[PDB]
Structure formats: structure tokens, C-alpha cells
Amino acid sequence: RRRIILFPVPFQGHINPILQLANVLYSKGFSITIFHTNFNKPKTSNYPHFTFRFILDNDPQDERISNLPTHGPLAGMRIPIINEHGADELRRELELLMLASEEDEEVSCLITDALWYFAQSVADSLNLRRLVLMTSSLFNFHAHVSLPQFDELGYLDPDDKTRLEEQASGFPMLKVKDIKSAYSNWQILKEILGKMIKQTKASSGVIWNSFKELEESELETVIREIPAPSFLIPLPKHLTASSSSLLDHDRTVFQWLDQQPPSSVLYVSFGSTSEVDEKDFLEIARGLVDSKQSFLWVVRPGFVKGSTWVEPLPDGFLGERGRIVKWVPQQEVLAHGAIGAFWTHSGWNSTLESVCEGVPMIFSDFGLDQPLNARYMSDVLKVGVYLENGWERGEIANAIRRVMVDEEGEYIRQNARVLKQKADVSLMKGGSSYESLESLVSYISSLT
Ligand SMILES: C=C1C[C@@]23CC[C@H]4[C@@](C)(CCC[C@@]4(C)C(=O)O)[C@@H]2CC[C@]1(O[C@H]1O[C@@H](CO)[C@H](O)[C@@H](O)[C@@H]1O)C3
Ligand SMILES: O=c1ccn([C@@H]2O[C@H](COP(=O)(O)OP(=O)(O)O)[C@@H](O)[C@H]2O)c(=O)[nH]1
Numbered sequence: 107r108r109r110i111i112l113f114p115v116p117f118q119g120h121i122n123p124i125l126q127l128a129n130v131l132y133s134k135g136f137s138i139t140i141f142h143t144n145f146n147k148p149k150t151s152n153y154p155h156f157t158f159r160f161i162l163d164n165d166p167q168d169e170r171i172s173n174l175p176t177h178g179p180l181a182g183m184r185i186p187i188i189n190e191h192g193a194d195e196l197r198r199e200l201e202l203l204m205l206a207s208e209e210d211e212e213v214s215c216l217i218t219d220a221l222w223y224f225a226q227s228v229a230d231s232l233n234l235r236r237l238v239l240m241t242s243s244l245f246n247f248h249a250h251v252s253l254p255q256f257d258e259l260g261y262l263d264p265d266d267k268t269r270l271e272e273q274a275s276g277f278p279m280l281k282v283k284d285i286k287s288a289y290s291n292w293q294i295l296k297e298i299l300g301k302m303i304k305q306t307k308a309s310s311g312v313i314w315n316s317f318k319e320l321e322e323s324e325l326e327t328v329i330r331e332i333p334a335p336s337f338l339i340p341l342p343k344h345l346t347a348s349s350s351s352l353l354d355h356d357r358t359v360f361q362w363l364d365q366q367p368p369s370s371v372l373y374v375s376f377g378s379t380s381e382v383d384e385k386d387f388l389e390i391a392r393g394l395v396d397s398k399q400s401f402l403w404v405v406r407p408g409f410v411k412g413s414t415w416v417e418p419l420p421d422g423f424l425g426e427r428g429r430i431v432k433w434v435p436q437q438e439v440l441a442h443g444a445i446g447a448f449w450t451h452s453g454w455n456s457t458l459e460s461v462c463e464g465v466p467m468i469f470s471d472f473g474l475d476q477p478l479n480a481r482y483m484s485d486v487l488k489v490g491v492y493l494e495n496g497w498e499r500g501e502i503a504n505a506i507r508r509v510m511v512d513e514e515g516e517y518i519r520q521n522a523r524v525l526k527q528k529a530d531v532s533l534m535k536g537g538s539s540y541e542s543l544e545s546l547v548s549y550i551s552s553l554t
Pocket of ligand 2: 457
């Protein structure tokens, strides 16, 4: 028997894809140990077939992580901190487990989130192969490697050059605006994405949460930039991420979806970390009302400054066609026949989820990879509408109706359907994903 150790980034968009991959790999006969912080831990009772081991986080706490907030923006600081100071403890924990390794057993490899760029030399120091799971898109990575051309061109200059600002030089699939919002945090991202790229290239293999027919324009870049083998597996086509939810599913929403006609409900979720002016919040609700479409709206507490929740909503916007909830099994909702469209913040999991369920999109974004994802889906795949100019009453309602009801948007509806079908075909025998997965399984067994 061969064991695989997976090490996720403790946030919802990173734990979902890696526990999905963990399950896929277990279905291939590997045994699974998940290294994880106590912080943001999943429900281990949802994984009786996995062994969990909690690290880096343990209660005699480091000065650098002991007082970090558990939600909002600042919680993400754990990622730079653990990267810069967790090598010693990761090495001990890995080495302890290999030492207790049973007779019949051998650790095939370590698989980490690509942001755990410190794990590469730790693994090397043990003569242990490390593979990388990318949780953002091939296209996004293509932009990271092209940063130096963006910087020297002045695109990553937040204050001024403000100038050309439609269509990027040498990267025509982007506009200048996309680049500016994605890398507006240049100070921190510049350093981190360097190390992430550098250590992903130096790894033993990269697993991408994607599929060849989703991002075919991007395959050449990955082959040329990454010497190790790459494997494209659309994790949502294998199973949803409900078992790794960090929140309680609202569960009442399916009885409500069962009361709606087919393709007639807008699903709306702006991301677990994002934030809006209280004003802009009221503008969003304005567009929904003005769309005349039924909607299911996930709103995370804190989405509105300064309220706990949407207190600033004039009570009774919802009425008949609208509902607001705090958390759902998102992909299961996207699979329900009532859903006709997904207004998303363009998180990569949400985008891939919607693509794998056949649901066309309305895109907003809040930087990082999000504007890139919206640009790509809306302009290249053409499976949604990108509200790329903020939050205006009518533009919002036009996009929703165009996707959901307008004749003019049939091609968007149809494109989503065709792309889902292509995702399904790629899992079958002789499909891109099927072979990517067959190769990954073969490859890992040869490491052992
Ligand atoms: C790659 C990233 C490095 C970091 C580090 C923190 C950093 C910053 C968030 C950029 C803004 C300044 C701060 C200091 C901040 O947290 O406010 C960057 C960029 C995003 C990081 O990634 C995760 O952040 C999680 C929530 O904080 C998201 O839930 C997850 O899905 C992200 O991948 C988090
Ligand atoms: O009500 C919700 C909202 C989101 N999610 C899940 O949370 C993840 C969010 O990841 P994404 O990359 O799309 O956005 P992020 O919040 O990390 O920026 C996705 O897997 C969603 O299916 C969910 O299960 N229920």
C-alpha cells in the first residue's frame, strides 16, 4: 500500500480542491494523510477514510500567528508567516510519519497547495517527492509568468500610468484594467508569486484544477514553463466539495428551489472574503429587483460594511422572488434544475463549478485572479457577461436578463451547455482528464 500526504492552505477555496483530489486519489487505492492547521480545520468526521494530523498551529502558539484574526482580510497573513517559518516543524512532522511508516507502507509523495512554496526544500531535505496542486487557472499562471513584461510596461503601476487601459501589450486576451486590479497588491504579491512560481517549476509535478478543453490556449505556456509533468483534472466533475464545508449548509433552499420553474432562478454569491460599499450593496440589490428574476443570494456576514449582515436592506426587497441565506452547498445548488444563471465574483472554484454544472454566469470581481477569470470566461469561452465597470442599476439588470431571458443571449446559454458536455466527455475513457488522471496515478506509483 502507498500513502500520500496532502497539505492544504487553510481556507475554503484551497481546502475544497485538495480534499477533492484526496478523494480521487483514494479512489485509486492510495491511503491519505491530511496535514492541516487547527485553524479553519474541516470536519474530520466527514473523512473517516483519511488520517488527519494537525500541525503548525498547535496550542503552544508562535508569537507570529497567535493573535492573527480568524476572518476577513488579515487572516490570510498566515500564508506568508507559515511559509517563512514552518519548515522545521513540517520536516519533523513528515519525518515522524515516515519513521512510524508500517512495513507494507511507503510514502509515495507530498502534495501541497502551490502557495506552500516553502514545502519544496523541506521535501527535498527528506528525499521526498513533492507535487503541487494549483487552485487557480492555467491562464492565471500564464499572467504570473508574464508579470515582468507587465511591470516594465508600467501596468503594475497603481498610481498613474492609468492610460491606455484597454487591451494589453503582448497579452491580447487581457485589457490593461484587468492587470491593474489583479496586481494592485503588487508589494506583497510580487514576492509571493515569485517564490510560488519558482518552487512550482522545481517540484516533481503540477496538478491543475481545470481541463484541457477549458483552457486549451494555455497548455503551451505550462509545458514550456514547467519541466515537471502537468496533469489537468476537473475536480468538481469527480465530486462536490460539500464534505469540506467550513460552515453549516442552509439546507432549506432545496425545498424553495423545488417551487421554481426550470432555469428561472439567479444564484448569486460574491465570495467568502469580499467586501462592498454599503452603498454598492444597496445598488446590487437594486439591480436584482430591477432584473425581475427570482434569486438565491448567499451573503456572508461582513460582506457589508459596517453591518453584521445586510441590515441596510430596506426590509422587503426579497418578497416573493428573492431569498438571502448565509451558506449553501454551492455546487449542489448549481446542479439543481431551477438555477438559470450564476452571478459570481469569479473565484476559480466557483467558476469551474458553474462550468461543470452547465450554468452561465454574470461576472463581478474583487481583484486577484478574479478579473482574469471573468475576462477569460466572458471573452474567450464566452459563457457569461462581465460587469467590468462596477455596479450600475441597469447594467446589472441587463446582464442578468441577457443571460437568463433575452433571445440575444441564447449563445451564452448554449455555450455553457456545450462546455459542460466537454467536461463530461473529458472524464470518459480516452478523454483529456481521464488520461491526465491515469498518468498521475502511474506517475506517483513510480515515485514509489
Ligand atoms: C496569496 C495570498 C497571500 C495573501 C496574504 C495576505 C494579504 C493578501 C490577502 C493581499 C492583501 C493583504 C493581505 C495581508 C491581507 O490578507 O489583507 C494576500 C493575497 C491573497 C492571499 O491568498 C488567500 O487569502 C485568503 C483570505 O485572506 C483567501 O480566502 C484565499 O482563497 C486566498 O487564496 C493571502
Ligand atoms: O454558499 C457557499 C459559497 C461558496 N461555497 C464554496 O466555497 C468555495 C469558494 O471558492 P472560490 O474560489 O470560488 O472563491 P473564494 O471565496 O475562495 O474567493 C467554492 O468551492 C464554493 O462552492 C459554498 O460551498 N457555499
